[PDB]
Design brief:
Chains A, B, C, D, E, F, G, H, I, J: This is Pancreatic trypsin inhibitor. Ten copies of one chain form a homodecamer. The first copy, chain A, is built from one helix and two strands, in the order ββα. The first copy, chain A, has one helix spanning 48-55; strands at residues 18-24, 29-35. Chain A has a single domain (1-56), classed as Pancreatic trypsin inhibitor Kunitz domain (Factor Xa Inhibitor, Irregular).
Chain lengths: 56, 56, 56, 56, 56, 56, 56, 56, 56, 56
């Protein structure tokens, strides 16, 4: 799996509260987290399916 | 039905206010609840259909 | 994980061609499959998120 | 529950193949069925949540 | 039309601000209202189409 | 209500089978119909809410 | 074009902050505006496509 | 407006039947057309809003 | 690519917090940003696909 | 960028016709393609945003 899948989720500085998925290496599962709307990092997926396919 | 379908809904520590479904054993129906966006428990479905099929 | 998560995907007799998720025990990942629109079995999730949470 | 919740699903004369929900009295659950796109009857819900709240 | 179609809209105790439809008997039309995310009453439809078919 | 609200539904020459709403003056309700994807007429709403507000 | 298409956008008394479209006669284009979730006026479309077809 | 807004809609070689919007210079409006799923040209918008804002 | 693709994102005076895409010339990629709901500028796409096609 | 981003799109054996995104290394852009509904490969994103972030 790509290296960025090991990064912890990053909400970023913005103020929106949107749900995104991230690969949780420890649990070996994609989980949700609140993304702020800007300055996203690589371990941030709009679609769960894409999360598990890229990082699972 | 799976045992987690008996757990009460868990909003979690996060600050988003997203609607999700959970199986209400007492009512024998899936209902909505506000999910904060992170650290979800098993009795939490994004889709009502999946809720009633897994827990109903 | 619930036992239905071990069932293979069931398209059913109907004619629609809708994408749904199912837990693929051998891959240990949820994947897509075409659902016909009726007579669904338990290993069939409208949302990938619900799939990995219930069966992952 | 309203009386229409006891009607069996009606696909209708049209040619589209859209998924809709209907209350299956015998199962006491809302399930999917393929709607043709026209001449819908009362036991036909676009949203699973609405189905179980109206008929459940 | 079902009797619940006469109830006025109920936002409920929750804090989310989601748009839902309700049948406005006086106007004989479904209209929107802000649903809080929990403890919904019968006159609350996620889909406008469902509102007008059930109550219209 | 606008005059186009009295026009009957027009599927058009195209081949897609998309659900749209149209105001059925006779029934005094918006209903669904299968739109072909092109050459739409005025009595064609992507949103049921818009149909009933514009023509209802 | 219907006369309501000339009305300026009405947010309404409610507290939700949903995006809707309205026909901006002066720009001769549909644009976005924040709808509060209740007490909507006619120049308020959930779908941009509906706005331009009804008012454009 | 960008020059591509003057191009006529291109369905492409693929077989899907998805609705998209294109700017119709003659009508000075964005309209729908059936996109095949591949080899899209510039005058092809997934969102009506983006169509009218880029080309309108 | 159109010149507006070089403009930095504009959130606008409104108070909604919706995610939109804008072309970031320096990164040569479309990214997200929080849009207020009104007074949008051209480098603002509701769909990421439209973003990269128009500006990429 | 991950290696899978260099793979060409794979429709697969299934019969559904759903649009997905893939990274087109030659064009240095994500584009659409028709996915069959099953047996997906890694260069297949349900969301354009995820595509450009993972592969762009």
């Amino acid at each position: 799996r790509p290296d960025f899948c090991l990064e912890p989720p990053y909400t970023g500085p913005c103020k929106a509260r949107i749900i995104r998925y991230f690969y949780n290496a420890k649990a070996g599962l994609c989980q949700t987290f609140v993304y702020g709307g800007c300055r996203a990092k690589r371990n941030n997926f709009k679609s769960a399916e894409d999360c598990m396919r890229t990082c699972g």
